[PDB]
Paper text:
Alanine racemase (EC 5.1.1.1) is a pyridoxal-5′-phosphate (PLP) dependent enzyme which catalyzes the reversible racemization of l-alanine and d-alanine. As d-alanine is an essential component of the bacterial cell-wall peptidoglycan, inhibition of alanine racemase is lethal to those prokaryotic organisms that are dependent on this enzyme for d-alanine, thus making the enzyme an attractive antibiotic drug target. Structural studies of alanine racemase from bacteria such as Geobacillus stearothermophilus, Pseudomonas aeruginosa, Streptococcus lavendulae, Mycobacterium tuberculosis, Escherichia coli, Bacillus anthracis and Enterococcus faecalis indicate that the enzyme is a homodimer in its native con­formation. Each monomer has two domains: an α/β-barrel at the N-terminus and a C-terminal domain which is predominantly β-stranded.
The crystal structure of [name] alanine racemase (AlrSas), the sequence of which corresponds to that from the highly antibiotic-resistant [name] strain, has been solved to 2.15 Å resolution. The tertiary structure of [name] alanine racemase (AlrSas) is a homodimer comprised of two identical monomers, consistent with previous crystallographic studies of alanine racemases. Inspection of our X-ray structure revealed that the AlrSas homodimer has two active sites, both of which are comprised of residues from the N-terminal domain of one monomer and residues from the C-terminal domain of the second monomer. The essential PLP cofactor is covalently bound to the highly conserved catalytic lysine (Lys39) via an internal aldimine linkage and extends towards the centre of the α/β-barrel. In AlrSas the density for Lys131 is not consistent with carbamylation and in addition there is poor density for the side chain of Arg138, implying that this residue may be poorly ordered. Notably, in place of a carbamylated lysine the AlrSas structure contains a bound sulfate molecule. However, in the AlrSas structure, while it looks as if this sulfate is substituting for a carbamate or chloride ion at this position, it is likely to be too bulky and highly charged to do so effectively, which may offer an explanation as to why Arg138 is poorly ordered. In the structure of AlrSas there is one acetate, which is a weak inhibitor of alanine racemase, per active site. The carboxylate group of the AlrSas acetate forms a hydrogen bond to Met312′ NH, analogous to the interactions made by the carboxylate group of alanine.
Author numbering:
A (entry chain B): 2 to 169, 179 to 257, 274 to 382
B (entry chain A): 2 to 169, 177 to 256, 275 to 382
Amino acid sequence: SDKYYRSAYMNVDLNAVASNFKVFSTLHPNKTVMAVVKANAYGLGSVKVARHLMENGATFFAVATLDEAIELRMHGITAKILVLGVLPAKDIDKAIQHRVALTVPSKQWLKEAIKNISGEQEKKLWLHIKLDTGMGRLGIKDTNTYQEVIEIIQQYEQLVFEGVFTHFTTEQYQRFKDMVNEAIKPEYIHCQNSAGSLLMDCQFCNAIRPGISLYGYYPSEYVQQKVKVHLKPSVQLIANVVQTKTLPTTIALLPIGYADGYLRIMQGSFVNVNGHQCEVIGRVCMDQTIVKVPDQVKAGDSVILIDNHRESPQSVEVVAEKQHTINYEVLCNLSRRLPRIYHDGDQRFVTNELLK
Amino acid sequence: SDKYYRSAYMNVDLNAVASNFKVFSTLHPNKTVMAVVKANAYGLGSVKVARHLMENGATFFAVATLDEAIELRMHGITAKILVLGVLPAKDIDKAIQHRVALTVPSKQWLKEAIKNISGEQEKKLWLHIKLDTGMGRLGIKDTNTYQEVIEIIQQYEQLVFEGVFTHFDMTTEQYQRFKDMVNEAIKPEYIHCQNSAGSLLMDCQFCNAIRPGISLYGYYPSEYVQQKVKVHLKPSVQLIANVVQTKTTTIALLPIGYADGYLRIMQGSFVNVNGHQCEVIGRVCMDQTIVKVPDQVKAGDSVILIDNHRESPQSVEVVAEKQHTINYEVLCNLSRRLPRIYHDGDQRFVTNELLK
Ligand SMILES: *Cc1c(COP(=O)(O)O)cnc(C)c1O
Ligand SMILES: *Cc1c(COP(=O)(O)O)cnc(C)c1O
C-alpha cells in the first residue's frame, strides 16, 4: 500500500501470525483466544495484525491503552477489545463511545469512573475485574472487595460485569478460583498469558490471552524447552548495502541505526550478508551501521540483521542477549521509521508511518 | 489538537528549540544554519519542529532519508531539504519531483541515479557530494574520483553540483583534508563540515553552512563540549507520567514501560514524584513501571522521568548513563506511543500518532 524510500525494513509474516494464533485455538478449541496486540502488536503493527487475525477468526483483542483501542476502531476493527491498563476516570465516556471494555483495578477507580459518566454516551460500559492473586501489582486482593465491586456494578444497568481475570503459580491459580467462586461468574474468566496457554489447560477459565507467542516467540527458554509445539517467528529486519569501502578488509555501510531501534550495544554483533556471518564494527550510528564484509559484497546486497528462525545467530533471542535484555524489548525497540512489509502468501503490502 | 487517553507523555518546548537555533545563527552570522531534523527531530517530531523553525528564519533542513523529506513537504515545509543518507537509485524521480537535494556517496551511485531519471521529470536534481576525509565511512575518499564525479554532473544540464560536505588532532587532519580536496575542484554554493560539536567549538572559515542537530534540542554532544563552550543550551524535553494506583511501604504504579522507550535497564533509577526522589523497583514491564514512594503519594500525582535541566538527577545524560548509552539514543528510544505536547508561549498542542 505505502511506498518507501530507504532500503531498510521489517518483513512481517502474517501467515506465520495466523498460524501461531491457530496453534492456540487448536490447543484450546473451546476457549475464546483474546489476542494481545498491545504496544502496536509488539512492534509488528497492531492495525494490520488485528485485521489479519480477524480474517482468521479472531473475535476479541486486548490492548494496553485506550488510544490503542481507538486506533483499532478507527481502522475498521469491530471485534471486542479490552484495555488492560487503567483508564483515567475522566476519559470514561470515550471508552463507552467506542464500545471498549475496561479493566477495573480497584473499587476507588470504579466509583470515580461512575461519577464521570455523563448522559452523553448511553451504550453499555463493559468491565473486566482484575484480581490481584498474590503477584501484587494491579488489582483487587480481598474477596470482600471483589463482592463489593460486583455489587456496585449490578446497581447500574449501564454497567456490565463482562469478565474477571488475573495475571501470573499453583497457589495463585487456587487463590483465583477461591475468589471467583465466592460470587456470580461473568461471561469471561481469563488468567493465561502465552506461557500459561502453552503450559496449563486451566479448565476453570474460558478465555486465554496469548501475546508474544502469536508473533512466534516463547516467553522464555524454559517454556521453549518444556512445551513441544512449534511457533513460527514472524519478523525479519533487513537492510541493503549502500556502499562498500576498502580500508586488508572491505567494509559495508548499511542505512540503518539506533534511531531505527538497532541499538548502539549491537556493535560486535554478526549479521547475515548472502550467507556470510559478518561482524558489526565501529560505533552503530543514528542512521548507519558498518559491517566487515568479504571482498565480493557490493552495494545493493541484502543483509539480515534479525532473522525469522529461532536457531540462528540473527534470532530475536540472540539479539536480546546482545542487548542484555529480553526478546519482548528487542521487538518493541523497532522504530516507526522502518516500513513494515506484510507478507500474506504472495500478497505483499507496506505500512510506512512517515508518509501517512 | 490531538486528544490522548493515557497519563504518559512528552513535553516538547518549541521556544527552547527556537532559542537554541538562534544560538547557532548568532555564533555563525554568515553561515546557513542547516537544521538537522532527521529521526523525527531526534524524537521531538520533525514536522512540528521544522514548522516552528521556519517561523523563526530557518531556510534549510537536513534529514536522514527521503521519506523524512517528503514527510516535511507534505506538511507545508517549503525550505530546501537535503537527504544525508543514500537514496535507492530507482527512487530518483521522487526526489526530483519533491525538490529534495540528495547526497552523492560514490561515482557508482551517481551513474545509477542518472540512469533512473525519467525523460518526463525535468526539475533539477540538486546534489551535495559527500567526502570521506578520514573516517573511512560514507562518501568519496579519493580526489580524482571527486573530480570525475563533478565532471559527470557538469555533463547533465538537469544536475546541479549544489554542495560538498564531510562529517567529523583527529579532527584537525580531517578538516585540512576536507579543505585540500575541495580546493582541488570548482567550489559549489554550499560547503559544510560542522555538526553541533563543530559548530560550538570551531570557526571553519572555509565553510558557509553548518549542520547542528542534537544541540538544537538543547543537549551537548559530550561533556567535553558542554564544558568548553561559552553558550547556554535549553533542554527541550520532559518525560512525564501520572501515578494510576498505589498499594501498601507504599508502591506506585506508572502507566509507562519499555514499549514507550523507558527501557528495562531503568530498573533502580530514581524519578521525581512531586519533589521526592523515588526508586524504580522490581522489573520495568512493557506498559507499566513500579516506583517506591512516600506514604502521601496518591493516584493522579505527576512524576518526572526525564527533566528539562542539565543538572538534574532526571537529566537526559543521567538517564543515558543508566542506559549505558548516549543522550542521542535516549531521545530516539521514546516511542510513537507517547503523545508529544508542544509548548509555544501559552499555546499548547498535542500530537498523538495512534489517533492520526
Ligand atoms: C502483556 C499481557 C499479556 C501477554 O503476555 P505475553 O507474555 O506476551 O503472552 C497477558 N495478560 C496481561 C494482563 C498482559 O498485560
Ligand atoms: C546527524 C548528522 C549531523 C548532526 O550531528 P549532531 O551531533 O546531532 O549535531 C551532521 N551531519 C550529518 C551528516 C549527520 O548525519
